[PDB]
Design a protein around this ligand. Structure first.
Ligand SMILES: [Mg+2]
Ligand SMILES: [Mg+2]
Ligand SMILES: [Mg+2]
Ligand SMILES: [Mg+2]
Ligand SMILES: [Mg+2]
Ligand SMILES: [Mg+2]
Ligand SMILES: [Mg+2]
Ligand SMILES: [Mg+2]
Ligand SMILES: [Mg+2]
Ligand SMILES: [Mg+2]
Ligand SMILES: [Mg+2]
Ligand SMILES: [Mg+2]
Ligand SMILES: [Mg+2]
Ligand SMILES: [Mg+2]
Ligand SMILES: [Mg+2]
Ligand SMILES: [Mg+2]
Ligand SMILES: [Mg+2]
Ligand SMILES: [Mg+2]
Ligand SMILES: [Mg+2]
Ligand SMILES: [Mg+2]
Ligand SMILES: [Mg+2]
Lengths: 162, 119, 38, 198, 249
RNA sequence: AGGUAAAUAAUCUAAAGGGAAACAGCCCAGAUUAAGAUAUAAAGUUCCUAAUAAAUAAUAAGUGAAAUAAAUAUUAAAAU
RNA sequence: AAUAUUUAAAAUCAAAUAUAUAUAUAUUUGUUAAUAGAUAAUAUACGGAUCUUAAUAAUAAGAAUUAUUUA
RNA sequence: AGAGUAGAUAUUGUAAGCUAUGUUUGCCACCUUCGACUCAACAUUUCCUCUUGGUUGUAAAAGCUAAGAAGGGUU
RNA sequence: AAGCUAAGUUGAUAAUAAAUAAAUAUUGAAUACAUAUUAAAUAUGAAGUUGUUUUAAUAAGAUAAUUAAUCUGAUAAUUUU
């Protein structure tokens, strides 16, 4: 009886935004939160046989928080398959070569279930080092929360793009 | 020793909680066994159940097993034991002359409360 | 230079040193006293 | 601690002031954290120097007697006291530099060993023995002159810079244990081994 | 005339920061590269002749590379492409062979249909030659070094001996039918597989080669030929890219 | 010595299920057939993976986090 | 503060409990940490991700290690 | 301990002690081909090449010992 | 004779640059001294590392044409580049 009704809104791939400049969680703990919202556990309509994930946009990744000395000690491995060609890159090298978004993407990828939906769930995670992203308008906005935003700033974000 | 019995040498915090609970349950069984004897003796003297429970004098057990099980020196209560004795047992062929309690077979059921004074 | 797990002070001029996650010894009086904790 | 407790006598010609940073760097560490949100600008007749002191360090001022005292909010923490002593030492060194000027004497003892200034004094050419031109450029804030080829005098407002440059020159040929030969940063001496020539 | 639109504060109030530069980027990669400062030429190898020096009599093999209608077609810039290069065309070709799309592309750049087209990457704008300017053998100077690049001669399925210089097996002393084989190819059951890259029979040739530091010993435009000492990869009538040597000057 | 010979107890042999990643012999717990409401055992509760919040101290080594590697040396902390 | 020993609830001290009960007797419990030493062959191997927190500041994080505990 | 002109720790290091590897000779029985030719891949406990510390026993040159180093080479 | 070859000819050992291991230093307190820091600041340092050069693979991007009697491919024929 509870299932009968308009179910379209429930299965809507909303877009969430996390600003690492304001968020105070570390890399691992933030990754765990991002994985849960990508899997869809936050939705009461979730079933393991369905991909109910929601797009997650992460900005200002350069202010990520890594504790200890992992930034220069943690090693990322990638083996082609031939003996003697194992590559061990430290986190410092990876971010300098690809970016801070890849650290989050790598962390989230492990959290995701090892299913056929892993790759589809990972691409839903968009990570940007800075604040400039093409998905600025692709976020959950509400009428009752536009009072705080000044009009000149609002117009710049909407019309003035790229 | 090729076959892998991956039994760790330390317990998790959750195993320790369960061990403390199991010791308390055994003590509560002993506490209840004595209580029944005290109440039964009091009823034999003529008293009723209620006054027996409220009697100032508590008849101590006379059997050897129950008398010793009520001695803290012989069978200490959980709140009386040391942390080492709660989680560690005595083995004479181990470094430190101690080994994890969880390595004792059927440790959940068997009761080992006393260890040698200096070991 | 002496690479030993046991580093000791012989000369009254040796001084212990903590660097690169290791213990060093240097003696201005005599250079044979130099050792590293390895 | 004890070094940081020493009074600091400031002459009238040398003025010392504390300021604040518009961009406070926050360098992270283990269980302890550090924040730098203040600046000290020591000024005197012989140039001026600046230091970025930590936020948890404040300078007490007393016009009478020209005495200034450096204090920290909590001296119990090891990190604070360690920084307290270092800050005390350096500001004193900056003050001494801007009022008198630090000096370094480089002495060459080997035969044919000498230093000649090139590029209108900007370059120091060392001749401690080699088939390749050897020398390093003088940095900003360091003035180098050579009273004689054998000797050399180096001065500047920063004690750390002048001695680092002098030490860098020394690395070309440190003193030899057998016959004294090389560059001497100061009056330091090297014990000569016996002349047991085989 | 304002369309409806709503903004979430999560990005309206966010501070503005510029993403740092990453090595995986055309900008950083271009700055790391080792590129020459001048454009190049497309040539067709016509053969090889002896070059007799008239002052000392030394006889050195020289391969003749002709230039025919070598014209610059269009440019490539960092702002729109990420690298600096000069597209160069060679030769002339009948309209019946060139695709309609390509014939339009050439017309847009006011050039003839061309036998070949190639790019010569350069260090910066200063090396970009204006489009439509014809290029001559005089573009190179006597006695300077250039790098040649061409597809090598085909050789078909070539065995281990001819491909990697394997010494094969004994030719006598009881050897069985297997003489021209490499012998072993792995270990016994530890890897359980032939490791990748194992040297093995295959096809060699029709492959790109880059001979470096080839010396120019005669430049003349009245015959439309360039003389370069030595050998240039490829067969009769094979396109060769000449450009200033990066290693030697 | 995953060796050999006996003594006591349990399990496998002939034992499903949960836990120890995988696991004949270890910790629980023994399958008549259903259902699935409630208690649960061992074991767990950041995500993969069903489930959590706290109190007091120590660690700065990623030591450690489900298979503890020793004599000794260094640094530091308490008591006499 | 310097120097020389040990790292101990045995003795002593503190606390809790059972009896005679304002006290005494008896029983029980409470005494260091980090690093180096540190070691081989297809490939990093806590099962993997990953785990140590940060005021300006978020509806909101601050061991997911070790030791003793609570709900 | 003892040699090292002097001095145990430049170099050497009796006999006993604590360990690491599974490269030799063994032990258990869960499990019934040495050498040569060809091609080699991997480790470093580094033979040469590169940087460095010690060497009354580093005057120079050759050397001894030790640390970082597996990119190239090793009839 | 052409072709193929090496016993022959030509070239290459891939710079510049960045951070580094052992090691050599400046200032400097915690700890009046000393201490290159397992404190904050400042420098050197290897045939190694990142890179660079070279080959192979995908094609982000770019120029142009877009119902065709000389738009794009393939089948078909004469062939070796
Ligand atoms: Mg042969
Ligand atoms: Mg034959
Ligand atoms: Mg075989
Ligand atoms: Mg047996
Ligand atoms: Mg049977
Ligand atoms: Mg079973
Ligand atoms: Mg049975
Ligand atoms: Mg049954
Ligand atoms: Mg670990
Ligand atoms: Mg587990
Ligand atoms: Mg006692
Ligand atoms: Mg491994
Ligand atoms: Mg002697
Ligand atoms: Mg011996
Ligand atoms: Mg080594
Ligand atoms: Mg010599
Ligand atoms: Mg290299
Ligand atoms: Mg040659
Ligand atoms: Mg001092
Ligand atoms: Mg010194
Ligand atoms: Mg180099």
């Amino acid at each position: 009886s509870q299932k009968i009704g308009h179910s379209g809104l429930a299965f809507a791939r909303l877009w969430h935004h996390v600003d690492v400049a304001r968020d105070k969680r570390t890399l691992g703990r933030l990754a765990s939160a991002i994985a849960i919202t990508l899997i869809g556990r936050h939705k009461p309509v979730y079933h393991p046989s369905q991909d109910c994930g929601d797009y997650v946009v992460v900005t200002n990744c350069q202010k990520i928080r890594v504790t200890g000395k992992k930034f220069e000690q943690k090693t990322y491995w990638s083996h082609s398959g031939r003996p003697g060609q194992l590559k061990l890159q430290t986190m410092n090298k990876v971010v300098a070569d690809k970016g801070f978004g890849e650290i989050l993407k790598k962390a989230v990828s492990g959290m995701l279930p090892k299913n056929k939906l892993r790759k589809q769930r990972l691409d839903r995670l968009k990570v940007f080092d800075g604040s400039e992203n093409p998905y600025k308008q692709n976020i959950t906005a509400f009428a009752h929360e536009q009072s705080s935003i000044p009009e000149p700033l609002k117009e710049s974000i909407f019309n003035q793009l790229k | 020793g090729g076959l892998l019995w991956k039994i760790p040498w330390r317990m998790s915090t959750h195993q320790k909680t369960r061990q403390r609970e199991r010791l308390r349950n055994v003590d509560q069984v002993i506490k209840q066994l004595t209580l029944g004897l005290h109440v039964q003796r009091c009823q034999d003297k003529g008293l009723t159940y209620q006054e027996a429970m409220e009697s100032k004098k508590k008849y101590k057990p006379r059997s050897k097993s129950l008398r010793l099980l009520n001695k803290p020196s012989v069978f200490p209560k959980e709140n009386q034991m040391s942390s080492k004795d709660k989680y560690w047992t005595f083995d004479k062929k181990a470094v430190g002359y101690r080994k994890g309690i969880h390595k004792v077979p059927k440790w959940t059921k068997i009761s080992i409360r006393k260890a040698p004074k200096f070991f | 230079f002496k690479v030993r797990t046991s580093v000791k002070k012989f000369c009254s001029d040796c001084y212990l040193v903590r660097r690169k996650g290791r213990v060093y010894i240097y003696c201005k009086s005599n250079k044979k006293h130099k050792q590293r904790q390895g | 601690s004890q070094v940081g407790s020493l009074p600091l006598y400031i002459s009238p010609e040398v003025q010392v002031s504390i300021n604040a940073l518009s961009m406070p760097r926050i360098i992270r560490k283990g269980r302890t954290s550090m924040n730098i949100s203040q600046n000290i600008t020591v000024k005197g007749p012989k140039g001026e120097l600046s230091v970025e002191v930590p936020d948890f360090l404040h300078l007490d001022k007393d016009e009478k007697h020209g005495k200034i005292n450096v204090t920290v909010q909590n001296s119990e923490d090891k990190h604070q006291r360690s920084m307290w002593g270092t800050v005390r030492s350096l500001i004193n060194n900056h003050i001494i530099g801007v009022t008198e000027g630090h000096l370094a004497v480089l002495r060459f003892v080997g035969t044919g060993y000498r230093a000649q200034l090139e590029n209108d004094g900007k370059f120091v050419n060392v001749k401690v023995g080699a088939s390749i031109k050897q020398g390093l450029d003088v940095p900003e804030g360091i003035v180098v002159k050579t009273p004689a080829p054998t000797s050399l005098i180096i001065e500047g407002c920063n004690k750390q810079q002048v001695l680092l440059f002098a030490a860098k020159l020394r690395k070309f040929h440190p003193p030899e244990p057998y016959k004294g030969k090389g560059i001497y940063v100061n009056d330091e001496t090297i014990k000569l081994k016996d002349k047991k020539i085989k | 005339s304002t369309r409806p639109f709503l903004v979430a504060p999560s990005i309206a109030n966010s501070i503005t920061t510029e993403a740092p530069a990453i090595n995986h980027s055309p900008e950083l990669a271009n700055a790391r590269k080792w590129l020459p400062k001048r454009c190049g030429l497309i040539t067709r190898k016509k053969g090889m002749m002896p070059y007799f020096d008239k002052s000392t009599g030394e006889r050195s093999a020289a391969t003749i590379l002709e230039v025919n209608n070598v014209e610059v077609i269009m440019h490539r810039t960092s702002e729109v492409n990420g690298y600096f290069a000069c597209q160069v065309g060679y030769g002339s070709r009948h309209l019946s062979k060139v695709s309609r799309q390509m014939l339009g592309h050439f017309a847009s750049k006011v050039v003839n249909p061309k036998e070949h087209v190639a790019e010569f990457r350069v260090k910066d704008e200063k090396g970009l030659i204006p489009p439509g300017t014809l290029l001559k053998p005089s573009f190179f100077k006597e006695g300077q070094y250039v790098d040649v690049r061409s597809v090598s001669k085909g050789k078909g399925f070539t065995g281990v001996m001819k491909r990697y210089g394997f010494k094969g097996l004994r030719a006598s002393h009881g050897t069985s039918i297997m003489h021209r084989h490499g012998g072993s190819y792995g270990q016994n059951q530890d890897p359980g597989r032939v490791l990748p890259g194992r040297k093995m029979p295959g096809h060699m040739g029709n492959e790109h080669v880059t001979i470096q530091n080839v010396k120019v010993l005669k430049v003349d435009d009245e015959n439309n030929v360039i003389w370069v000492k030595g050998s240039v990869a490829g067969p009769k009538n094979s396109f060769v890219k000449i450009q200033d040597a990066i290693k030697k000057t």
